[PDB]
Amino acid sequence: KIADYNYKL
Amino acid sequence: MIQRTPKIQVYSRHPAENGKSNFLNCYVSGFHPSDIEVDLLKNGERIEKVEHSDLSFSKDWSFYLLYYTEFTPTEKDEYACRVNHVTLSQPKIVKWDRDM
Amino acid sequence: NSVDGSHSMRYFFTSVSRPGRGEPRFIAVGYVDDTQFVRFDSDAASQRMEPRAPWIEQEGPEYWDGETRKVKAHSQTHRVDLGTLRGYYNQSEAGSHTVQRMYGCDVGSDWRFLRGYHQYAYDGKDYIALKEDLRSWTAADMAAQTTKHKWEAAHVAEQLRAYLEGTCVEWLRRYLENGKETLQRTDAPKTHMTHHAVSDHEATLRCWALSFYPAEITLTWQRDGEDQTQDTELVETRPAGDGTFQKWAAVVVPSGQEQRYTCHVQHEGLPKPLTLRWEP
Numbered sequence: 371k372i373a374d375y376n377y378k379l
Numbered sequence: 380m381i382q383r384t385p386k387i388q389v390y391s392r393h394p395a396e397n398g399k400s401n402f403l404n405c406y407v408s409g410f411h412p413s414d415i416e417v418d419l420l421k422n423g424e425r426i427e428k429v430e431h432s433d434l435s436f437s438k439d440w441s442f443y444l445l446y447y448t449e450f451t452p453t454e455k456d457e458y459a460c461r462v463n464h465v466t467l468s469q470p471k472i473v474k475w476d477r478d479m
Numbered sequence: 480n481s482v483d484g485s486h487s488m489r490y491f492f493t494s495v496s497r498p499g500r501g502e503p504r505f506i507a508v509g510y511v512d513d514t515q516f517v518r519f520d521s522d523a524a525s526q527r528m529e530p531r532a533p534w535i536e537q538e539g540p541e542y543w544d545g546e547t548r549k550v551k552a553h554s555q556t557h558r559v560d561l562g563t564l565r566g567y568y569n570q571s572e573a574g575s576h577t578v579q580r581m582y583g584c585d586v587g588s589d590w591r592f593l594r595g596y597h598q599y600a601y602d603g604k605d606y607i608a609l610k611e612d613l614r615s616w617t618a619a620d621m622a623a624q625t626t627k628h629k630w631e632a633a634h635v636a637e638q639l640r641a642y643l644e645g646t647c648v649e650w651l652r653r654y655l656e657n658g659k660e661t662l663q664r665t666d667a668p669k670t671h672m673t674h675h676a677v678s679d680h681e682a683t684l685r686c687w688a689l690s691f692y693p694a695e696i697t698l699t700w701q702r703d704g705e706d707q708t709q710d711t712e713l714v715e716t717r718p719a720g721d722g723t724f725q726k727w728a729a730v731v732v733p734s735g736q737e738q739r740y741t742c743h744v745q746h747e748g749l750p751k752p753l754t755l756r757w758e759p
Contacts, residue, residue: 371542371545371546371646371650372490372507372509372517372546372549372550372553373490373549373582373639373642373646373647374549374642374646375638375639375642376552376553376555376556377556377630377633377635377638378556378559378560378563379559379560379563379564379567379599379607379625379626379629380602381602381603381604383603386715388714388715388717390717390725392719392720392721393689393719394671394689402720402721404717404718404719404720406717406718408715408717409715411577411602411603412495412575412577412602412603413493413495413577414495414575432515432718433506433508433515433518433520433531434493434506434508435491435493435506435508435510435515436491436493436579436581440579440600440603440604440605441603442493445717445718445720447720478673478675478685479685479714479727479729
């Protein structure tokens, strides 16, 4: 399962 | 801007046996960017139910895809893979060899 | 260069900006070792994360709804990222650029956490990468050093480490038992040799390894047991398309000296190297 949390550069 | 030429190799899934159905594969790898044009040829003209893997890459970020259709080899039908890319001035055609 | 883990789950994300108009193209692919199980393609008509392995079709609507909600979140991040990096390196709107991200986890024999990783790339070049301790970052560029500072302040690594050591490991363990017949398998390579008379004083011996899994493979040609690291032609390991992989190696022998030559196949399913000769 892929990660739930994304962050931008 | 970096750009890398695709390594092409066309081949069958199982050893070729005349009359038996098989899968003809064209595997392009090691290229960048991702926009690539690939067809499979039966006596030099395009096959029309060709599928391809979902795009992926390696540790060096080079892309790879596998184009494949389904075919029955005979004794004098010539199969090939035509590949075009930014790094290619003209489309590169690699002929299929039952022995590679 | 470090030791292999017994198993690994890896996710691969690619965003390609298409200038003019249209949101960038987004492809997501997930692997357990050398077996793909999930796909998402922005150009596809489903607009959902789709199964590409039979053992993952088991999961019900909550799994797929969740993955589809989170895969589109990845999409959106790289839409912002593609704009940020084009402003970071100061490039026109007219150019087509690519963003690649990959993360995942390895486990040892005990199926407990061994290693984690999460890396980015812009236009093929290394950009930012999380360190091996899952606590710091490596900037390949002074632009990526800005992201390093933004992410270290926001404590991004603490959230990623939670996934790598947590959700990544436990759900890979569950995929391994849900697909034991496919993922916990070892297919020993089928092997054969061919012979093609190049000319009058030379012939080619091609050493075939077919229908093996995992993809890790070593073929080597020897004459009198001496490795011919030069004067041998080796091809990159390719997928057969049926879930197994292929590779061959060729060497040009002088006619009448075939017996002096040996090919050797080394694979997970071969405890000792398998010797291949030319015998019609």
